Amino acid sequence: GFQPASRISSIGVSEILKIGARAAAMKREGKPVIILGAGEPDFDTPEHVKQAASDAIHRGETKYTALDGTPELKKAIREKFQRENGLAYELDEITVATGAKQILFNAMMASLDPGDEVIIPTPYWTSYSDIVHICEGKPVLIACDASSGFRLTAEKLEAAITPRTRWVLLNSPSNPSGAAYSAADYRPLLEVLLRHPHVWLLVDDMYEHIVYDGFRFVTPAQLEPGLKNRTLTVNGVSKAYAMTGWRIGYAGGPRELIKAMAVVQSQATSCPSSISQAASVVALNGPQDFLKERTESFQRRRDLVVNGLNAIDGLDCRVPEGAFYTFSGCAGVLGKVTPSGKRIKTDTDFCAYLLEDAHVAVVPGSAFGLSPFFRISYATSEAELKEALERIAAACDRLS
Amino acid sequence: GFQPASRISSIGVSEILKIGARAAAMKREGKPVIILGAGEPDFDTPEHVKQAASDAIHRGETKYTALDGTPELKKAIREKFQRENGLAYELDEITVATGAKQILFNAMMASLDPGDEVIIPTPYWTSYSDIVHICEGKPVLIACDASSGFRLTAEKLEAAITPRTRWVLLNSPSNPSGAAYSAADYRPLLEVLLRHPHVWLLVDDMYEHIVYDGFRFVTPAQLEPGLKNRTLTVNGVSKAYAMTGWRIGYAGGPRELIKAMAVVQSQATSCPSSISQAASVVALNGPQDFLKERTESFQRRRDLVVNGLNAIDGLDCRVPEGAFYTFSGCAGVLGKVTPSGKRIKTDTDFCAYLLEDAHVAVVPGSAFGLSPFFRISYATSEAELKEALERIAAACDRLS
Numbered sequence: 001g002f003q004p005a006s007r008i009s010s011i012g013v014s015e016i017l018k019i020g021a022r023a024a025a026m027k028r029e030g031k032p033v034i035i036l037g038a039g040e041p042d043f044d045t046p047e048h049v050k051q052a053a054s055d056a057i058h059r060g061e062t063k064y065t066a067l068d069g070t071p072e073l074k075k076a077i078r079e080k081f082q083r084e085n086g087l088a089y090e091l092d093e094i095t096v097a098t099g100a101k102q103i104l105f106n107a108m109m110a111s112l113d114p115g116d117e118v119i120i121p122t123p124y125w126t127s128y129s130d131i132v133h134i135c136e137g138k139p140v141l142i143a144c145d146a147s148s149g150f151r152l153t154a155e156k157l158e159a160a161i162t163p164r165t166r167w168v169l170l171n172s173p174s175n176p177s178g179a180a181y182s183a184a185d186y187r188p189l190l191e192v193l194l195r196h197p198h199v200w201l202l203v204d205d206m207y208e209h210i211v212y213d214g215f216r217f218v219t220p221a222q223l224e225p226g227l228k229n230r231t232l233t234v235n236g237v238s239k240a241y242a243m244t245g246w247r248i249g250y251a252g253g254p255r256e257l258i259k260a261m262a263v264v265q266s267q268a269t270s271c272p273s274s275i276s277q278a279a280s281v282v283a284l285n286g287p288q289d290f291l292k293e294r295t296e297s298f299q300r301r302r303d304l305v306v307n308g309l310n311a312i313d314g315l316d317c318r319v320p321e322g323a324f325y326t327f328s329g330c331a332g333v334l335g336k337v338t339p340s341g342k343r344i345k346t347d348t349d350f351c352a353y354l355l356e357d358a359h360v361a362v363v364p365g366s367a368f369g370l371s372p373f374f375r376i377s378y379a380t381s382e383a384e385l386k387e388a389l390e391r392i393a394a395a396c397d398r399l400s
Numbered sequence: 401g402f403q404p405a406s407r408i409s410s411i412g413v414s415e416i417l418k419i420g421a422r423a424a425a426m427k428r429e430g431k432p433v434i435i436l437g438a439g440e441p442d443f444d445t446p447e448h449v450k451q452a453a454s455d456a457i458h459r460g461e462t463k464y465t466a467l468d469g470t471p472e473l474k475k476a477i478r479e480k481f482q483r484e485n486g487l488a489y490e491l492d493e494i495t496v497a498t499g500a501k502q503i504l505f506n507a508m509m510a511s512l513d514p515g516d517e518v519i520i521p522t523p524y525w526t527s528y529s530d531i532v533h534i535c536e537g538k539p540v541l542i543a544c545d546a547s548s549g550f551r552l553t554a555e556k557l558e559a560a561i562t563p564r565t566r567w568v569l570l571n572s573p574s575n576p577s578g579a580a581y582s583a584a585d586y587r588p589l590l591e592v593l594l595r596h597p598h599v600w601l602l603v604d605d606m607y608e609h610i611v612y613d614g615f616r617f618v619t620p621a622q623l624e625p626g627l628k629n630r631t632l633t634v635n636g637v638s639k640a641y642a643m644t645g646w647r648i649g650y651a652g653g654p655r656e657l658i659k660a661m662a663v664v665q666s667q668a669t670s671c672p673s674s675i676s677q678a679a680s681v682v683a684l685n686g687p688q689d690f691l692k693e694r695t696e697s698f699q700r701r702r703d704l705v706v707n708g709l710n711a712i713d714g715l716d717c718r719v720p721e722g723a724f725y726t727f728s729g730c731a732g733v734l735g736k737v738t739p740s741g742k743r744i745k746t747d748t749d750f751c752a753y754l755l756e757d758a759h760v761a762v763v764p765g766s767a768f769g770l771s772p773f774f775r776i777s778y779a780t781s782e783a784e785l786k787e788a789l790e791r792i793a794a795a796c797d798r799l800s
């Protein structure tokens with residue numbers, strides 16, 4: 001009889017998976033369901049990156065690499081940080097792993113002891129707290145509502161820090177709100193952190209290259225040199241280059257942390273795929289102009305969803321600054337009754353109604369730690385979004 | 401300053417890496433050291449496997465897959481276990497990870513609580529005990545000397561089992577010994593394990609397809625159906641297909657352990673590379689005849705090393721059954737003096753003399769937990785092996 005380790009005892013089944021399972025069963029019943037939960041861009045890997053992978057395969061780059069990345073890829077990353085972020089890292093301050101997921105995992109495994117706290121602003125994707133839990137740490141969730149654009153404030157950060165705080169997670173743009181920090185937004189938070197030298201910064205910049213309206217992306221180790229010696233700047237090719245299947249993430253940070261992360265990586269995975277690494281060299285080093293057209297395509301779909309929802313009675317949707325999610329408010333539908341007699345008390349109730357009665361799957365704000373809201377991923381076709389918006393509107397109009 | 405987590409406090413630097421670094425420095429100095437430490441086969445990924453990868457890239461198989469493997473790869477693994485090992489595993493009993501390294505890591509992370517014991521027969525590679533350490537377990541090392549062919553015996557396994565024993569590691573063929581368990585070798589251990597239902601079997605079959613002399617490969621869950629509900633059968637494409645850089649390992653085992661491993665994998669890596677998975681489908685489903693020529697090439701090189709060492713007074717080398725390592729005794733050189741006046745007291749001293757004065761780098765048995773021996777990897781060219789054996793013989797002749 002199998003007995004799971006205690007370290008996974010606090011990891012449950014995500015509400016997102018439960019929703020996915022219900023939608024899947026409904027399809028088996030013969031009920032087509034639109035699921036608005038895409039977690040990867042609906043673009044392919046760029047052709048020149050595909051060709052670089054094929055060339056590496058042909059040349060026989062099929063052997064183990066250096067544990068935490070080829071020198072060539074580390075140099076491509078160093079150049080990316082300098083070119084794109086005005087951020088200077090040495091080669092021994094750079095690490096490469098199997099996705100940004102493993103970057104985050106390695107960093108927590110390399111640092112957290114039982115009871116160590118990690119401050120996580122919400123709304124947030126629970127994947128972050130599951131990583132903290134398996135490393136025996138304590139997630140400390142800090143709710144940030146629309147009044148601060150879903151962003152952490154200096155006052156809330158200061159009040160959240162305790163003797164056990166080891167990290168603060170700063171993820172911008174984020175899943176599910178799409179909120180991004182400008183330099184003005186970051187500065188008061190970095191001032192707080194300058195006064196807390198034992199608190200390290202876990203910076204997740206994965207949506208850097210999906211930002212809208214001309215937003216100038218910045219990152220804390222760039223803005224505040226006084227925090228560079230305790231910041232892990234996490235990034236990767238998954239979202240920027242539509243390379244989620246390739247599993248390459250990377251980071252820049254202090255050499256002693258990078259060294260500890262390599263100890264974890266040596267136990268967990270050894271080196272990431274040599275083929276994906278070779279692909280990622282050319283993703284970073286090659287032409288970048290194609291990113292503009294993809295951003296414009298995402299932004300057109302952002303506007304479609306935001307404007308669609310703000311034409312529906314009961315909903316109020318802010319304009320996300322980046323990533324490919326909307327996090328619309330739905331306070332206006334609470335208290336209404338469905339045609340079948342059900343009272344809509346929570347955003348959970350509302351999303352369950354949209355699923356069963358409108359055959360559209362969205363995720364309630366309750367699952368991300370802030371209500372009353374719901375998340376749409378618009379990394380899908382304009383046609384599917386238009387149909388889903390029509391169904392959501394019709395279902396909202398049937399509430400009374 | 402950075403404080404590493406307690407969970408890596410027992411993981412140090414491997415003596416193998418220190419030896420490789422010193423050998424590498426000598427070569428930079430113009431001393432043409434032959435380093436006999438290859439841990440991957442010196443063949444390339446088969447052409448048809450390369451083509452399948454390039455085809456999958458071109459088709460756009462660049463997205464996240466199912467967390468623990470595509471249905472196509474799980475089906476190919478299911479057929480491999482049935483066709484090659486007579487083992488019947490369901491789809492929910494199969495998992496795919498970033499190398500067999502991650503299979504082992506996930507299994508230990510999913511099961512071990514602090515203080516849980518894992519029995520590790522020695523001679524062993526400390527990579528196994530490092531994994532147990534980072535999962536907060538206690539490696540229980542059981543030395544198996546040449547009198548049992550470097551294999552675990554029933555009496556030693558029975559004596560080593562305690563209430564806290566969670567796993568016994570059964571790795572056949574072995575790095576560093578090259579020894580493999582026949583059915584007759586396994587049977588008394590399996591009889592012991594039937595009497596201890598709390599002990600699970602961690603079966604590392606990675607060198608399955610590098611076995612010699614017509615050896616009939618067998619694996620515990622096939623040999624003893626009464627243990628299949630608590631055996632993890634670990635395997636992978638790295639060694640069989642020369643695909644170490646692609647990072648794909650897999651396992652068959654009880655559904656509840658497979659489920660818990662997926663919880664770990666979701667925090668550590670998400671899915672392994674979609675491209676490597678597609679290559680591995682064809683590695684497993686494709687033609688296997690090429691393995692014959694590779695085995696014959698490996699066996700010729702094995703014979704070079706065994707016969708070469710046994711022509712040197714003071715060395716006694718057993719014939720390995722599989723993998724590409726010899727683990728020769730060197731008791732007959734202990735007590736002798738080098739031309740520079742150093743007395744050779746340990747296999748450590750002997751190997752340092754071979755490095756500095758014969759310009760051949762091998763690893764002493766002390767590094768694997770059994771003396772007096774030394775390990776050679778013969779996954780290199782016959783010419784390089786013949787030259788290395790000449791140098792070892794000359795250096796042994798100069799002893800007094």
Ligand SMILES: *Cc1c(COP(=O)(O)O)cnc(C)c1O
Pocket residue numbers: 098099100101102171173174175204205206207236237238239244247248249669670
């Ligand atoms: C996609 C994503 C990740 C995971 O990246 P992978 O490299 O695919 O593992 C981590 N953080 C954020 C904010 C992401 O969008």
Ligand SMILES: *Cc1c(COP(=O)(O)O)cnc(C)c1O
Pocket residue numbers: 269270498499500501502571575604605606607636637638639644647648649
């Ligand atoms: C090579 C090897 C491993 C590691 O396999 P990867 O898939 O490359 O991580 C594990 N066990 C044994 C016996 C091996 O030979």
